[PDB]
Write a protein that binds this ligand. Structure first.
Ligand SMILES: COc1cc(/C=C/C(=O)O)ccc1O
Length: 328
């Protein structure tokens, strides 16, 4: 059987929290007044929800309403409880209210509005300084939720809303987030393909906060190398092959051997043998102004096969890459 694993930090946060904190199935939802919110326009539709811009008519302020699609009451309460637990934390999207939508017959989550630039165009314009700045801001959010016993499990550009005018950032869509409990096995069908950690791709279920750090590394690679997404797999199998062509196959085998994991035999014909590459090979004249020795070392320390070897969010904030970022 597989070798067990533990987070190297915040391991027992939920253990010593009162049960009410992590037992979301028992959570009793406090409902606001649905008539306070008037929908203005549809912003997007996902697998699990529709998202609208709206107005709070009690203060005439813009808000965002997320009307959940019919899914397990467990998952609905999970997202709600996690959002309430994390409310007020650094760069955590603020849940302002919860109402019953009369048409969908489901909960509608009301969020603070973020006046964002969509990640397609913004990533085109981010400077070296901007990338360091916003990475640091994401780390504040990740160290906070990890310190609060929660892993996000869907870190990707879409879920990092940035108001570039006020240089404000919010980590959104906590619909896949979970409470970390030592020894617990989790669903590996989380995160978007390009941001899935090697643990997910090799079906290792006893993972932890460090999953988010792989995803963050994928985002960083895409920003400093100007290639979005960086690991661009055609499916979940090809995704691991794409990673192995960069990190190499010998360290992949070291990883699965450490946890006594077996690869899907379908990899036998597609994985091949690959040396580990040096990050400098991805540098060229159109991205070099975004690359520094500090950037490459930081990236290198996020993108490890072994989830136990990755920088923690707090360790990441100590990295020399962020020395040039103004703190106040
Ligand atoms: C699309 O724009 C927004 C989305 C959200 C939240 C989304 C979620 O939590 O799923 C919050 C504020 C926004 O401005």
């Amino acid at each position: 059987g597989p070798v067990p694993s533990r987070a190297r930090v915040y391991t027992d946060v939920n253990t010593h929290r009162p049960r009410e904190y992590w037992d979301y199935e028992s959570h009793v939802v406090e409902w606001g007044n649905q008539d306070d919110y008037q929908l203005v326009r549809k912003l997007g539709r996902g697998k699990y929800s529709e998202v609208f811009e709206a107005i709070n008519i009690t203060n005439n302020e813009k808000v965002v309403v997320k009307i959940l699609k019919p899914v397990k009451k467990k998952k609905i309460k999970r997202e709600i409880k996690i959002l309430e637990n994390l409310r007020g934390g650094p760069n955590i999207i603020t849940l302002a209210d919860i109402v019953k939508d009369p048409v969908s017959r489901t909960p509608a989550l009301v969020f603070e509005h973020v006046n964002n630039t969509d990640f397609k165009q913004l990533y085109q314009t981010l400077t070296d300084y901007d990338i360091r700045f916003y990475m640091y801001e994401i780390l504040k959010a990740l160290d906070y939720c990890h310190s609060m016993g929660i892993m996000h499990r869907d870190v990707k550009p879409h879920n990092v809303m940035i108001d570039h005018e006020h240089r404000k950032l919010r980590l959104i869509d906590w619909g896949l987030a979970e409470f970390y409990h030592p020894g617990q096995e989790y669903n590996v069908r989380v995160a978007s393909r390009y941001f899935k950690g090697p643990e997910l791709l090799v079906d290792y279920q006893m993972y932890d906060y460090s999953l988010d750090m792989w995803s963050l590394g994928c985002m960083l690679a895409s920003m400093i190398f100007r290639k979005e997404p960086f690991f661009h797999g055609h499916d979940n199998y090809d995704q691991l092959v794409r990673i192995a062509k960069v990190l190499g196959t010998e360290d992949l085998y070291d990883y699965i051997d450490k946890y006594n994991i077996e690869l899907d035999p379908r990899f036998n014909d597609i994985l091949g043998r690959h040396s580990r590459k040096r990050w400098e090979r991805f540098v060229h004249s159109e991205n070099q102004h975004l690359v520094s020795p500090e950037a490459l070392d930081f990236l290198d320390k996020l993108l490890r096969y072994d989830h136990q070897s990755r920088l923690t969010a707090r360790e990441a904030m100590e990295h020399p890459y962020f020395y040039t970022v103004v703190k106040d």
